[PDB]
């Protein structure tokens, strides 16, 4: 339990995304599950809130005055090739999970970025490059080991505590900290994917075709569109530097033949500054988004879920987020539907299953820039479900009403009840917080 101004406090308290500028009263760099339970026990004695950080990818509330458990040293993974499952400790990032599953020819339902904490991602739902085919990562869990608000370790399956197994798979840490989880693995060894990086002048054309194209693709095709002003930086090749880029991401988990057939029409649009679409070992999946996770940064994230992508919706995005807009934020359009739209084998509380698309924005916190982001998301409200994707929400989305928007009204009702039952003092509240039901007080 490091305290402020002790050696390595800052090390253990600060994550990748610093937008929640937070100062925990103590930080425990847990080495194992016992240290996690001990940290939680301590906090319960001191009537203190408890938060958990594996990477700092997903900030929400300030950890001021809280105990923060840093799980980054708990990076254990083990694979059961026979049963096609992996055991993943609290702090294991997907890159490490992939190291272990690839030798067997197995893939988890990981996301766009290998740097991301597998557990935090999963308990938000977890929308990746196999998701349109298989669903949310939270829909494919065998069991959980959990530190509950009394500081007890508990093994949990759909069998032993339905309520808790349901709530944790989409509820983040609101019901306890996950020390390890057992996930189903899938026989995926290769992807046909990469990017079509179009010049700015093509943005309207591309987004219009994309809106149509997505209506015909199978569930094996995950795809998204990034719109970004790229700086003149050496970290990207010369065709992408210092200009507006519309980047179409492909991730087809079937045969390259099929993928290429689907993709080929998109090439008739242009000009294409760079084309990386290719057959790759699934291990290389993190090259499709190639998201920078080396330096810490501050970013204000916000997203809305779209019931549909229409011409007029496209035109708003072109106008407020395309080349001439001069928007100082990145915009990403991610395709959902498919398996995401169908109820999971084993129920969970993951919301937004009716969404066709996620529309995401990432912004340096600066008032002119945040205004334009606001204007863009407001102008899309008519094509919006009212929902937000929880894993793509940011530090501005911390109020109870903002968190409610991540769940269906019924799921949230039930979640409030379960929360009262498993976290009566609302100890896990350094998070996208589900408040205890008022009826349970």
Ligand X SMILES: *Cc1cc2c(cc1C)nc1c(=O)[nH]c(=O)nc-1n2C[C@H](O)[C@H](O)[C@H](O)COP(=O)(O)OP(=O)(O)OC[C@H]1O[C@@H](n2cnc3c(N)ncnc32)[C@H](O)[C@@H]1O
**239-268 binders of a second copy (CB under 8 A):** 239, 256-257, 259-260, 267
Query: Which region among 55-63, 275-283, 337-345, 359-367 touches a second copy (by CB under 8 A)?
Result: 275-283
Query: Which region among 79-87, 273-281, 326-334, 406-414 touches a second copy (by CB under 8 A)?
Result: 273-281
**Integer Cα distance of 153 and 33 in angstroms:** 8
237 makes contact, choosing from ligand X, a second copy, none, with CB < 5 to 8 Å by partner type, with a second copy
Report helix, strand or coil for 209: helix
277 makes contact, choosing from a second copy, ligand X, none, with CB < 5 to 8 Å by partner type, with a second copy
Is 185 in contact with 97 (CB distance < 8 Å)? Answer: no
Is 47 in contact with 105 (CB distance < 8 Å)? Answer: no
Q: What is the dihedral angle through the alpha carbons of 390, 395, 400, 403, rounded to the nearest 10 degrees? A: -10
- Tracing tokens 């990562």 back to the chain, one arrives at 137
Query: From the CB of 124, what's the least distance to ligand X, in Å?
Result: 5
Q: Is 294 in the site for a second copy (CB under 8 A)?
A: yes
When binding is defined by CB under 8 A, the residue of 279, 291, 315, 374 that contacts a second copy is: 279
238 makes contact, choosing from ligand X, a second copy, none, with CB < 5 to 8 Å by partner type, with a second copy
Query: From the CB of 255, what's the least distance to a second copy, in Å?
Result: 9
Q: Is 96 in the site for a second copy (CB under 8 A)?
A: no
Quickly count: other Cβ atoms within 10 Å of residue 233's Cβ. Answer: 9
Residue 165 host element (H or E): helix 162-171
265 makes contact, choosing from a second copy, ligand X, none, with CB < 5 to 8 Å by partner type, with none
Q: Is 281 in the site for a second copy (CB under 8 A)?
A: yes
256 makes contact, choosing from a second copy, ligand X, none, with CB < 5 to 8 Å by partner type, with a second copy
In the sheet that holds 85-89, the strands lie side by side as: 77-80, 85-89, 177-184, 141-147, 153-156
177 makes contact, choosing from a second copy, ligand X, none, with CB < 5 to 8 Å by partner type, with ligand X
Report the DSSP beta bridge partners of residue 144.
Answer: 156, 181
Query: From the CB of 249, what's the least distance to a second copy, in Å?
Result: 14
**CA 181 to the chain's CA centroid:** 17
When binding is defined by CB under 8 A, the residue of 162, 218, 237, 265 that contacts a second copy is: 237
For binding to ligand X (CB under 6 A), which residues are involved? 15, 51-60, 71, 90, 111-113, 116-117, 119-121, 123-124, 126-128, 172-173, 177-178, 291, 293, 391, 431
Q: Is 76 in the site for a second copy (CB under 8 A)?
A: no
Q: Is 102 in the site for a second copy (CB under 8 A)?
A: no
**Integer Cα distance of 334 and 224 in angstroms:** 4
All residues at 6 or more sequence positions from 43 whose CB lies less than 8 Å from its CB, including other chains: 49, 50, 66, 67, 427
124 makes contact, choosing from ligand X, a second copy, none, with CB < 5 to 8 Å by partner type, with ligand X
275 makes contact, choosing from a second copy, ligand X, none, with CB < 5 to 8 Å by partner type, with a second copy
Q: Is 275 in the site for a second copy (CB under 8 A)?
A: yes
**Integer Cα distance of 376 and 379 in angstroms:** 5
170 makes contact, choosing from a second copy, ligand X, none, with CB < 5 to 8 Å by partner type, with none
Nearer to ligand X, 384 or 431 (CB): 431
Query: From the CB of 239, what's the least distance to a second copy, in Å?
Result: 6
Nearer to ligand X, 277 or 403 (CB): 403
**Integer Cα distance of 71 and 166 in angstroms:** 23
All residues at 6 or more sequence positions from 371 whose CB lies less than 8 Å from its CB, including other chains: none
Is 217 in contact with 223 (CB distance < 8 Å)? Answer: yes
Query: From the CB of 254, what's the least distance to a second copy, in Å?
Result: 12
Q: What is the 3-state secondary structure (H, E, C) of 302-354?
A: EEEEECCCCHHHHHHHHHHHCCCCCCCEEEEEEECCHHHHCCCCCCCCCCCCC
DSSP label at residue 143 = E
**Integer Cα distance of 59 and 63 in angstroms:** 10
CA nearest to 387, candidates 402, 399, 398, 377: 402
218 makes contact, choosing from a second copy, ligand X, none, with CB < 5 to 8 Å by partner type, with none
Residue 145 host element (H or E): strand 141-147
Query: From the CB of 209, what's the least distance to a second copy, in Å?
Result: 17
**173-202 binders of a second copy (CB under 8 A):** 192, 194
Q: Is 234 in the site for a second copy (CB under 8 A)?
A: yes
Number of residues that bind a second copy (CB under 8 A): 23
52 makes contact, choosing from ligand X, a second copy, none, with CB < 5 to 8 Å by partner type, with ligand X
Residues at the site binding a second copy, with contacts judged by CB under 8 A? 192, 194, 233-239, 256-257, 259-260, 267, 274-281, 294
């Amino acid at each position: 339990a490091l305290e402020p101004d002790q050696p390595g406090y800052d090390d253990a308290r600060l994550g990748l995304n610093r937008a929640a500028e937070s100062r925990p009263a103590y930080v425990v760099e847990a080495a194992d599950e016992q240290e996690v339970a001990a940290a939680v026990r301590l906090a319960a004695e001191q009537k203190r809130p408890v938060g958990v950080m594996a990477t700092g990818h997903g900030p929400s509330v300030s950890a001021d005055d809280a105990v923060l458990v840093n799980t980054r040293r708990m990076e254990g993974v083990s694979v059961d090739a026979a049963r096609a499952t992996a055991w993943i400790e609290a702090g294991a990032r997907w890159r490490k999970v992939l190291e272990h599953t690839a030798p067997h020819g197995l893939a988890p339902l990981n996301g766009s970025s290998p740097n991301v904490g597998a557990v935090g991602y999963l308990v938000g739902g977890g929308a990746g490059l196999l998701g349109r085919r298989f669903g949310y990562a939270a829909d494919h869990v065998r069991r959980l080991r959990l530190v509950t608000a009394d500081g007890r370790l508990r093994d949990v399956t759909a069998g032993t505590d339905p309520d808790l197994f349901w709530a944790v798979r989409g509820g983040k840490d609101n019901f306890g900290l996950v020390v390890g989880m057992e996930v189903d693995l899938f026989p995926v060894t290769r992807l046909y994917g990469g990017g079509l990086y179009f010049a700015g002048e093509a943005t309207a054309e591309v987004l219009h075709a994309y809106a149509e194209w997505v209506r015909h693709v199978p569930e094996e095709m995950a795809s998204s569109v990034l719109l970004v002003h790229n700086p003149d930086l050496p970290d990207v090749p010369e065709p992408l530097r210092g200009r507006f880029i519309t980047h179409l991401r492909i991730a087809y988990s079937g045969e390259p033949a099929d993928g290429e057939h689907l993709v080929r029409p998109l090439r008739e649009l242009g000009p294409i500054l760079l084309d990386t679409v290719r057959d790759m070992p699934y291990a290389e999946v993190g090259t499709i988004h190639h998201e920078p996770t080396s330096m810490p940064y501050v970013a204000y994230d916000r997203n809305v879920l779209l019931s549909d992508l229409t011409d007029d919706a496209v035109d708003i995005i072109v106008a407020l987020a395309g080349p001439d807009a001069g928007a100082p934020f990145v915009t990403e359009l991610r395709h959902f539907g498919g398996a995401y739209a169908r109820p999971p084998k084993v129920p969970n509380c993951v919301g937004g299953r009716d969404a066709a698309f996620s529309l995401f924005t990432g912004a340096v916190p600066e008032a002119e820039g945040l205004r334009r982001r606001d204007d863009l998301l407001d102008r899309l409200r008519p094509w919006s479900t009212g929902g937000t994707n929880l894993n793509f929400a940011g530090v501005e989305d911390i109020s109870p009403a903002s968190v409610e928007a991540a769940y269906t009204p019924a799921d949230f009702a039930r979640l409030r009840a379960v929360k009262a039952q498993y976290d009566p003092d609302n100890m896990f509240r350094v998070n996208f917080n589900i408040p205890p039901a008022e009826s349970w007080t």
